């Protein structure tokens, strides 16, 4: 949604410390799931290699194999992508929604 009864909406901060924050936990999962939905969508049908490759290009940060894979599988079961009867390496687009360009 939106901040709510707010005037301006724009935030941005930069921190350089080995330590790990908590907000970086949600931002990550989103960065991935988002990059996947965006990629898959645009590509009616994409494979694992083509996927992992595209996603990485969209993410300027290294992602773990457990998280990445998990994100995919889920999405697929989230009525977003389907595994080609032939091989589970290929995923087709199913999500329903209008588009402009």
Swiss-Prot record:
Signal peptide as annotated in the record: none
Cross-link Glycyl lysine isopeptide (Lys-Gly) (interchain with G-Cter in NEDD8) mapped to chain: 41
Localization, UniProt: Cytoplasm; Nucleus
Organism: Homo sapiens
Annotated protein name in UniProt: Cullin-4B
Family: Belongs to the cullin family.
Disease: Intellectual developmental disorder, X-linked, syndromic, Cabezas type: A syndromic form of X-linked intellectual disability characterized by severe intellectual deficit associated with short stature, craniofacial dysmorphism, small testes, muscle wasting in lower legs, kyphosis, joint hyperextensibility, pes cavus, small feet, and abnormalities of the toes. Additional neurologic manifestations include speech delay and impairment, tremor, seizures, gait ataxia, hyperactivity and decreased attention span.
Modification(s) after translation: Neddylated. Deneddylated via its interaction with the COP9 signalosome (CSN) complex.
Coiled coil: none
Positions of the Cullin neddylation domain: 27-87
Protein task: Core component of multiple cullin-RING-based E3 ubiquitin-protein ligase complexes which mediate the ubiquitination and subsequent proteasomal degradation of target proteins. The functional specificity of the E3 ubiquitin-protein ligase complex depends on the variable substrate recognition subunit. CUL4B may act within the complex as a scaffold protein, contributing to catalysis through positioning of the substrate and the ubiquitin-conjugating enzyme.
Record note on quaternary structure: Component of multiple DCX (DDB1-CUL4-X-box) E3 ubiquitin-protein ligase complexes that seem to be formed of DDB1, CUL4A or CUL4B, RBX1 and a variable substrate recognition component which seems to belong to a protein family described as DCAF (Ddb1- and Cul4-associated factor) or CDW (CUL4-DDB1-associated WD40-repeat) proteins. Component of the DCX(DTL) complex with the putative substrate recognition component DTL. Component of the DCX(DDB2) complex with the putative substrate recognition component DDB2.
Domain of life: Eukaryota
């Amino acid at each position: 949604g939106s901040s709510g009864s707010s005037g301006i909406q724009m935030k941005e901060t930069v921190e350089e410390q080995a330590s790990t924050t908590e907000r970086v936990f949600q931002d990550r999962q989103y960065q991935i799931d988002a990059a996947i939905v965006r990629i898959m969508k645009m590509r009616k049908t994409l494979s694992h290699n083509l996927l992992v490759s595209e996603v990485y290009n969209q993410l300027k940060f290294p992602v773990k194999p457990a998280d990445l894979k998990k994100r995919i599988e889920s999405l697929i079961d989230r009525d977003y992508m389907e595994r080609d009867k032939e091989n589970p390496n290929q995923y087709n687009y199913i999500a329903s929604g209008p588009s402009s360009g």
